Assembly symmetry: C2
Homo-oligomer: 266 residues x 2
């Protein structure tokens, strides 16, 4: 209930009503004792988006907030920001563009330390929209809908590697992103795909479980027992086949257990 976790949020989360997802991040960051850094670097309006979340978390009641306004990679070396990261209890990555966020943050001392403290179980990390997309080592940077799966449908890139064993997609059902996720999985079938809807969150707990929170669904797309794909045989614009996939679509309160590779009801 206040144990550190990683919250992967599908974008457009509730900022007005119960704010259940944002409240959960707040609680897992220490609640009234939270020291939270907001990274708005995905956005081309960082002050506005940074102020928005600032106001949300300050209204919830925290010990301290800081907007880590990294607009160039050199600020990833900044002593002041790096010191705050040592003191913090939670980090929140806003939406924007995931390629931009990784360009500014990936492999910086600041982000290396955030990732280390997350992996060590010292702090919580949340990311929404672009901030969700960057969670994997392999990242869906873009891509379209309205087509059958094909490798050209999805733009792959390198993320922050917070959760290396997964590939995240976001605004998922809302933007009909299943085909692009399937396209990503065809050539990374060792990775669990997570398609996370708007105002929905996959919360990765320290024990390996993933709890779903919020308004929609999380789709777990598992090609680890795939019996065949034509991916290596066909051109990038040709349709993909994927045989023997396992699909789990979860809603609020349900859990996917990563070690068991199975889902369970509320």
């Amino acid at each position: 209930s206040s144990q550190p976790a990683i919250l992967i949020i599908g974008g457009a989360e509730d900022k007005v009503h119960g704010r259940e997802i944002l409240q959960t991040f707040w609680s897992r960051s220490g609640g009234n004792d939270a020291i939270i850094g907001i990274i708005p670097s995905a956005s081309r309006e960082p002050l506005l988006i940074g102020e928005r979340y600032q106001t949300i978390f300050s209204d919830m009641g925290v010990k301290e907030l800081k907007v880590l306004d990294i607009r160039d990679r050199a600020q990833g070396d900044d002593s002041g920001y790096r010191l705050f990261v040592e003191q913090c209890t939670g980090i929140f990555m806003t939406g924007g563009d995931q390629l931009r966020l990784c360009g500014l943050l990936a492999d910086t001392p600041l982000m290396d330390r955030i990732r280390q403290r997350v992996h060590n179980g010292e702090i919580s990390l949340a990311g929404t929209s672009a901030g969700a997309a960057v969670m994997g080592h392999h990242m869906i940077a873009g891509g379209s809908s309205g087509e059958w799966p094909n490798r050209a449908l999805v733009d792959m890139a390198v993320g922050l590697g917070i959760v290396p064993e997964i590939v995240v997609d976001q605004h998922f059902h809302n933007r009909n992103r299943m085909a692009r996720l399937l396209s990503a999985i065809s050539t990374h079938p060792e990775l669990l795909g997570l398609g996370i809807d708007e105002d929905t969150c996959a919360m990765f707990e320290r024990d390996g479980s993933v709890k779903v929170i919020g308004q929609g669904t999380v789709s777990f797309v598992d090609a680890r027992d795939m019996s065949y794909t034509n991916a290596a045989l066909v051109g990038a614009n040709a349709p993909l086949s994927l045989h023997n996939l396992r699909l789990n679509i979860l809603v609020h309160g349900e859990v996917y257990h990563q070690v068991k590779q199975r889902a369970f009801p509320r």
Copy 2:
């Protein structure tokens, strides 16, 4: 050239190789084919009928008839029913699937088409609306851009040609996976087949399903589903579906219905 049932995802190629339509032609007897075209799904039946008349005539057939049923009474018409006894294949055009069922379902004419198809005497193809009618349970409409929920899909009664399946069409092109998942949640005993434009799932008499054409067929299987919240939640609430099996197939690949397994070309 053994009779088969071709379930076509719409917008099939009518101009180039016409691979799907040529397959129907072949399975209907080729140069000896006697093909009826049912344009009843459409509000322009004469024009769509003529389109397919031209295509199949160009391929070379023995005889064509447009079974222009525009009211349920014509389902009793002896001339059309006589043709159905003589034919070797029937093609159901696109349009609106509710309209097609409203006109054809449980008529003497359609009951005999269904029986001759079941008996292995004639081939059947349907595209777009004509594909949607193939199951007993039919997807009559619905939207995209939402998580699966029962209100996302409009279910109705189809023609029951292949009762153990539920078909969706123009599938990936119109992002219809969520509505198909929504349908399967209501009927998880049914194998869902999501068929892309210019793609076909061809049901063979041996129980296999061969995929033909440009895109994919998605076989969405909830028969081993471990849990769903479907019985507990309202129609507009998000649905969970645990332990689904998904097979996405392309041209030349085969799904075996009995063993529930797909195979490459």
